[PDB]
Amino acid sequence: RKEQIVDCRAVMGLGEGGGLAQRGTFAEGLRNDVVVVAMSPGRRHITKPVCEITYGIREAGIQTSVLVLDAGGGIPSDAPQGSLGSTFGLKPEEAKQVNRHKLCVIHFGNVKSHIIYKARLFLKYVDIPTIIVCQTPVDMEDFAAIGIKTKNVMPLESKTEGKIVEIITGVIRGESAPQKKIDEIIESIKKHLG
């Protein structure tokens, strides 16, 4: 039980009856322990799967920061045969804001082939241990098949400087996350933070 102060963003949200967060914005929780990364300020990512994880971390006693990615939708351009639909990417300032935290929690989606290259590009610039929160069951070996550092399944040629420390499956975008998933996230953060 201690005081928890958040440096709020400087930009207003999406209109009047819309989301409260804005794309490409960072909200510092003073003391930098856990940063929660959201792909977009839309209803698929904000307050249904992300702010719930955020309040679970804040209820566990760990100060939390929420960063909304500027371009979090789609696949990176280094995916096979280029990108389609939209291009996923990370800004250097976003990577610097993530890298000052002890741990990262990132929320991914459905398709297995999208998540692996998204995590590879994210960990090409992020060097802290991150927890991947997705919906479909991805095994923590398919990331090593494309060269991602990983606690249990290392690659021979590691193309990332950050390590996936836990995969948590069963969190749907735009839906209320149950207490059991929050408890798994809290236990993983406590076991891999101190």
Binding site: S77, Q81, L84
Partner: protein
């Protein structure tokens, strides 16, 4: 004979549409993109290697004797026998020099054996690969039909024809095939038209200035030239609509007396 007019109107937009439709009008060229660079942006074949074939050459295949079919001279790519490829363009509503229906009409008026398709934010022309590369270099890319900022050779994800331009005056691209190089002031294609990255970026030239874009565009805009300033085009459109209505009602000469 008959001297062909191409489009009604007195404004600069109607004049540009007439110039695009005219096959005897030489389009002003504004850049030099080499043939292998156009092939590389097109992304269909490796430059320097032979064209892939879909059938033997027309001399080798035996057809039935047809007098009417043999009157038409085939294309060279049809003579050798080449696969039919495509080149796709997106055109911004903010004073792009070429526009989709204008592009399709000019292609079908100027080129032989082409397959033109028109969408709101898309325009594609299909032809045999050698001839398609020839008119892609000669007409589609280097002339005043193309602007590397307000237009772009892009397949796959197309979006941004109705969106506002970016800080460099370029059309929005979700895949970012072409970027702006501020050191040279030129637009460089870092990906091909479908999205895989290029090993060497290719200079398609610098953006056309907006003052020239006002003169060479084929779109009507309130901030540019509106159709209210061109009553001749509206009258022709209304005459076409009335003639269609009268023909659909009763297609006789007495019903067309009220035209």
């Amino acid at each position: 004979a008959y001297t062909p007019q191409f489009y009604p109107g007195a404004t600069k937009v109607a004049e540009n549409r007439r110039n695009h439709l005219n096959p005897n009008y030489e389009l002003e060229k504004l850049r030099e993109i080499p043939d292998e660079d156009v092939v590389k942006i097109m992304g269909h074949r490796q430059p320097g290697e032979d064209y892939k074939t879909v059938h033997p050459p027309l001399e080798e295949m035996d057809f039935v004797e047809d007098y009417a079919r043999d009157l038409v001279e085939p294309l060279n790519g049809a003579k050798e026998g080449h696969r039919v490829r495509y080149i796709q363009f997106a055109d911004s509503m903010y004073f792009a020099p070429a526009q989709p229906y204008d592009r399709s009409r000019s292609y079908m008026s100027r080129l032989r054996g082409v397959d033109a398709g028109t969408l709101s934010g898309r325009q594609v022309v299909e032809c045999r690969e050698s001839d398609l590369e020839e008119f892609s270099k000669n007409i589609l890319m280097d002339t005043e039909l193309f602007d590397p900022a307000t237009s772009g050779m892009r397949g796959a994800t197309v979006h941004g024809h109705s969106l506002r331009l970016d800080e460099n005056g370029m059309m929005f691209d979700a895949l970012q095939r072409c970027v702006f190089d501020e050191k040279t002031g030129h637009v460089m294609y870092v990906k091909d038209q479908v999205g895989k990255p290029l090993d060497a970026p290719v200079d398609v030239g610098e953006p056309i200035p907006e003052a020239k874009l006002r003169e060479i565009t084929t779109i009507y805009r309130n901030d540019g030239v509106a159709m209210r300033a061109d009553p001749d085009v509206i009258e022709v459109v209304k005459r076409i609509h009335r003639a269609r209505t009268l023909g659909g009602y009763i297609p006789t000469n007495e019903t067309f007396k009220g035209l």
